[PDB]
Scaffold this active site. Structure first.
Site, short mmCIF file in Angstrom:
data_model
loop_
_atom_site.label_atom_id
_atom_site.label_comp_id
_atom_site.label_asym_id
_atom_site.label_seq_id
_atom_site.Cartn_x
_atom_site.Cartn_y
_atom_site.Cartn_z
N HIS A 52 0.79 -1.20 -0.26
CA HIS A 52 0.21 -0.05 -0.13
C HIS A 52 0.56 1.60 -0.19
O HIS A 52 2.01 1.13 -0.08
CB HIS A 52 -1.09 0.53 1.64
CG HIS A 52 -0.09 0.19 2.16
ND1 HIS A 52 0.52 1.39 2.39
CD2 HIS A 52 -0.09 -1.07 3.77
CE1 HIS A 52 1.33 1.30 4.37
NE2 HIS A 52 0.72 -0.60 4.80
N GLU A 82 -1.28 -6.43 7.51
CA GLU A 82 0.65 -6.86 8.34
C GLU A 82 0.20 -7.31 9.35
O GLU A 82 -1.18 -7.83 9.86
CB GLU A 82 -0.17 -5.24 8.66
CG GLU A 82 1.72 -4.63 9.24
CD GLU A 82 3.43 -5.19 7.99
OE1 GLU A 82 3.01 -4.78 7.11
OE2 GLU A 82 3.05 -6.44 8.84
#
Length: 171
Positions: free
Chosen positions: A8, A74
């Protein structure tokens, strides 16, 4: 299986150097710019994305409508969320650098993180684009025997679980 993994766009904690896991930070203006540049540079394939804001927004700006999966998040840093890398205890620094034996209080262990990530990838039955995080891309690249560090808003295509195909970074 051809899979494209996208890290991202940048958030404030990238420049600040703070551990960013489940803390739901938004993209910075530059992060959104990075996401927009991915549009047209990524293949038109089914898409999946971490459900965290920064990943979802990257997918949107990149021109996709991904199915959301927390499995692409994550790693959960627990009590270490937001901790400055600089002041992280040497034991944690080493664990993250060597990518092993890491289990922060209130968070996920690296082994659990890997199991989660690889179980998700094993389940993919056809080529797809995965909007995810630095640690996820790192886990995948390292498992394929390569350095796993890639720039924010960049992508890597792999033939899972055999080899890396290409790394794509845009200015």
């Amino acid at each position: 299986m051809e899979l494209w993994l996208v890290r991202h766009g940048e958030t404030l904690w990238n420049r600040e150097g703070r551990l960013l896991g489940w803390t739901d930070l938004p993209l910075t203006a530059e992060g959104e710019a990075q996401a927009r540049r991915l549009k047209g540079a990524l293949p038109s394939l089914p898409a999946f994305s971490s459900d965290l804001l920064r990943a979802r927004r990257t997918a949107e700006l990149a021109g996709f409508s991904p199915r959301l999966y927390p499995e692409l998040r994550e790693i959960h840093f627990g009590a270490l969320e937001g901790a400055l890398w600089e002041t992280l205890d040497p034991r944690y620094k080493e664990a993250l650098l060597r990518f092993q034996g890491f289990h922060p209080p209130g968070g996920e262990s690296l082994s659990a993180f890997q199991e989660r990530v690889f179980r998700f990838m094993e389940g993919l039955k056809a080529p797809a684009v995965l909007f995810t995080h630095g640690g996820v891309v790192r886990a995948v690249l390292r498992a394929l025997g390569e350095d796993g560090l890639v720039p924010p808003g960049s992508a890597v295509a792999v033939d899972w679980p055999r080899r890396v195909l290409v790394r794509l970074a845009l200015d």
